[PDB]
Amino acid sequence: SMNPPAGPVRAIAEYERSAAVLVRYPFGIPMELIKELAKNDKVITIVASESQKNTVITQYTQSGVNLSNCDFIIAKTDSYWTRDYTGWFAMYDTNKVGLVDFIYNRPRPNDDEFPKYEAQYLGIEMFGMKLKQTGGNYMTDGYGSAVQSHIAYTENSSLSQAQVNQKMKDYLGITHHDVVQDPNGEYINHVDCWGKYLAPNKILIRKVPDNHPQHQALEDMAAYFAAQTCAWGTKYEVYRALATNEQPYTNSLILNNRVFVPVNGPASVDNDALNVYKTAMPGYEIIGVKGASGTPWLGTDALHCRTHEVADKGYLYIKHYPILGEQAGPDYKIEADVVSCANATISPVQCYYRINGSGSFKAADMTMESTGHYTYSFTGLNKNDKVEYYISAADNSGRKETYPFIGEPDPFKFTCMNE
Ligand code: NA
């Protein structure tokens, strides 16, 4: 149809559950990456024909790829930049997952048309957002914020900024459309070359040497996010990836509990970048990925550019705003909504918690107050007690999710003040 999705709408972040990752043949990524992806996750390869599918299967077989995780879509494409032209994922109508198409900002008509084939393959509805856009220049936090470089306005110059913002609201549920002047001084003007939400409360911002012409622009961008309150109510934790030689360290893919970071030398500088991700993202497996010789990583074009995560059409979605830091009390009540996009019965919904840092986390059932709305109150806590917690839900489709996504390795933390 030509109508927007039935509300409310919520754009899905890259660090939410992914059912698959989308790549394209002829390839722009190394076979070793496809192999590593397929070890744990479904890889959907776009090919132009049944014969081309079989050519790819032969290559996957010869390279030892886990074929049980290899799926295919037959559709014409112009390029391997699946980040930039494939559809964007949003929840809509309470418990549905949909795809949002847009006008691809390149003269690549098969790439531009592709989202319809993606939606057909996935068995989900598609909605047409009439803005000139590109996925590389888009990221959302999963709480209604999105960051883009200035081309989101300048390539839609027949519309006012308000009209552009309204399109993002109507099709993606974006209420905070954070469009900024690109700090990189290069042609592409994509956020994924300088910035990446790692979680709702964490953002990675590129850093360069002091004498690099973009040094101050990037420091200013880091300061901007550090001063900004995030969706959870704390200031963003701002992490920095130092590019000594224009290495594309922010151009990584978060796929479930793994992070794939392009590396292109020197080894020590690559390892420093990987260390930043490891520090920022406890519990995640951080994986450095060397480029393919024929289609190497570039400063403006690397791993994030040549992949796109695919949301779970049956997503078990946990909506939660955490209790953090010094809390007054005397009640410490957490609330979460849990929705099954699989239309499955949800049970159990639990709070896992630990008090004052020792022993194992303990499970307590949350109380369902109304349909899909769960609460839990921490009892018996004394002044200055430290609480770690996370939420866990399961349904009878076999889905199991925590909030935060990674669960126990990175729990929410608060302190009981009793004041
Ligand atoms: Na399109």
Author numbering: 47 to 465
Sentences from the paper on this structure:
To this end, citrullination by the only known prokaryotic PAD expressed by keystone periodontal pathogen Porphyromonas gingivalis (PPAD) has been implicated in the aetiology of RA. PPAD is organised into four domains: the N-terminal signal peptide (NtSP, aa 1-48), catalytic/deiminase domain (CD, aa 49-360), Ig-like fold (IgLF, aa 361-463) and C-terminal domain (CTD, aa 464-556). The CD adopts the canonical fold of ββαβ motifs conserved among GME structures (RMSD 2.0–2.4 Å). The PPAD active site is an elongated cavity with its entrance exposed to the surface exterior.
Among them, a His6-tagged truncated construct (Asn49-Ala484, tPPADWT), encoding CD and IgLF but lacking NtSP and CTD, yielded highly soluble and crystallisable protein, with significantly increased catalytic activity towards the in vitro arginine substrate Nα-Benzoyl-L-arginine ethyl ester hydrochloride (BAEE) as compared with full length PPAD. We have determined the 1.46 Å and 1.48 Å structures of tPPADWT and tPPADC351A by molecular replacement, which reveal identical and superimposable conformations (root mean square deviation (RMSD)∼0.09 Å), suggesting that the Cys351Ala substitution did not perturb protein integrity. Difference Fourier electron density maps clearly reveal an active site-bound ligand, modelled in the tPPADC351A structure as an arginine-containing dipeptide, and in the tPPADWT structure as an amidino adduct where its Cζ atom is covalently linked to the Cys351 S atom. The tPPADWT structure, revealing an active site covalent adduct, captures a midway step of enzymatic turnover, likely after the Cys351 nucleophilic attack and NH3 formation steps. The acidic residues Asp238 and Asp130 serve to fixate the arginine guanidino Nη1 and Nη2 atoms by ionic interactions, thereby positioning the Cζ atom for a nucleophilic attack by the Cys351 sulphuryl group (as evidenced from the Cζ-S thioether bond in the tPPADWT structure). The imidazole group of His236 is in proximity to and at the opposite face of the guanidino plane from Cys351, and could act as a general acid/base for proton transfer. From our structural data, the arginine terminal carboxylate group is fixated by ionic interactions with Arg152 and Arg154, suggesting a role for these two basic residues in determining the reactivity of PPAD towards a C-terminal arginyl peptide substrate. As expected, tPPADWT only produced citrulline from Gly-Arg. The truncated form of PPAD secreted from P. gingivalis lacks the N-terminal 43 amino acids and CTD, and so has similar N-terminal/C-terminal boundaries to our tPPADWT construct.
